[PDB]
Design a binder for this molecule. Sequence first.
Ligand SMILES: Oc1ccc(C(c2cccc(O)c2)=C2[C@H]3CCC[C@@H]2CCC3)cc1
Ligand SMILES: Oc1ccc(C(c2cccc(O)c2)=C2[C@H]3CCC[C@@H]2CCC3)cc1
Lengths: 237, 234, 9, 9
Amino acid sequence: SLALSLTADQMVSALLDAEPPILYSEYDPTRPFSEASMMGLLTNLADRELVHMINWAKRVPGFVDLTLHDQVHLLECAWLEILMIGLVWRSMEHPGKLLFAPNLLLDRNQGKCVEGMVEIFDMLLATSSRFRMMNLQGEEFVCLKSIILLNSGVYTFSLEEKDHIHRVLDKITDTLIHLMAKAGLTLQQQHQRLAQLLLILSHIRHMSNKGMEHLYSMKCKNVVPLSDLLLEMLDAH
Amino acid sequence: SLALSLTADQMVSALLDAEPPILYSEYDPTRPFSEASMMGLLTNLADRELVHMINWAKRVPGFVDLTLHDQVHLLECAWLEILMIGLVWRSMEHPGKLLFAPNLLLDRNQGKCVEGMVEIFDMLLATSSRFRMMNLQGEEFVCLKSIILLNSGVYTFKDHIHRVLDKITDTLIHLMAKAGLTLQQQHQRLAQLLLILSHIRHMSNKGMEHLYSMKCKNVVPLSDLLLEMLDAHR
Amino acid sequence: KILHRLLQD
Amino acid sequence: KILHRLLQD
Ligand SMILES: Oc1ccc(C(c2cccc(O)c2)=C2[C@H]3CCC[C@@H]2CCC3)cc1
Ligand SMILES: Oc1ccc(C(c2cccc(O)c2)=C2[C@H]3CCC[C@@H]2CCC3)cc1
């Protein structure tokens, strides 16, 4: 492989260059609110983000080597997690707001629209506030996001492929530690922060499962229609 | 508090002594099992385990310092995770099998008697096989379980809880240093252990929906305690 | 709730 | 299989 032959600094650069762009929505601040329309916007946005995520996953070291079937499974399991941690990261500098798009900020109050969505908003807001108090760095973010991609579906796999995935996961771990060592953190502070970061992934999994149930609810409901791609990602769960 | 004033050796001993006992299931009805039969044994077992878990939680350093409300919220969020990681740990030296009780060892094939339960079994068996290849030690296990207790509900509210979580992190690293693992091997294994917690969370939510589905069907009557713990996830 | 009673005893 | 397509550029 080529992932294990990478230094920590090179690992960061590869992930940092592979970052997807921040997409805009078709939001109109003349149009007031709703709940069919908001979900319509969020569905349109998430569907376009998925296309970039899929091509982003290709540029994640190690993901290329995996079987097509393995790649499909990993994305099917973690796609909402990756969307959320991206959303949370974009919203760090906007307390009480969830920057879905530069032209779509939204509020906890606007989460009351759509039954059950307000609870998920609070959890996303709490995650963003956590990232803010930890002063999460961009280099640490791209590490965590790539960890989610490889780890979320690794426990649902003749195959020495799971061993190669854990090897890459160990490399990303070394990369995270390398970064914290640069920031002047003590050896004790490196362990604590590493733990703090990975424990957040447990809550991101929780939000994803909650969000997955919410999306399945609006699917069996007569409105709003989901994209053909989202329905495939949703049926995977 | 008193948790922060503990050495990692004292922290281990405190958690190791706090361990709940391994309870037995009812010796009747005995296999083979049906849907109503198996869930009846599991509900009864889990309900009695809950009582011991609550007492175990009080013995967890730092958990006492929290308000009663916070103690309620933490247990409500993580109770199924704690049962699961307990189940997985007991089933470690029983590959392909799940040890709910010393007199209740279940196969994958037995999980099919309940609609949608066999998928949770596989995830549990995979976690057990994962613990086995890592050779998870008991001292590491009691650390992981307390972490689940304090972490799983800390974002649905707390500087104290994070300080204790750091202390357990310091404890986990200490244990690995004793085993002769290098510094690089210490961070790596720490990451591996905590990443499994993400899958445990996933299993719990999958299991939570399963129990809620059983509740709706009205067939096998959940205990009033279980109903309260279940309603907390709604 | 029952959970409180078991936490106080 | 839309996901399978996009993975195959
Ligand atoms: O960057 C994004 C973009 C969109 C989301 C979506 C989403 C995802 C798919 C369809 C949809 O309508 C909404 C959601 C977020 C998080 C929970 C799932 C849903 C509904 C509430 C907000 C999350 C992150
Ligand atoms: O140690 C234990 C004991 C019981 C469980 C229970 C359980 C939990 C509550 C009520 C119930 O009937 C079953 C469950 C496990 C895990 C998922 C929920 C259910 C059903 C399948 C097995 C898990 C671990």
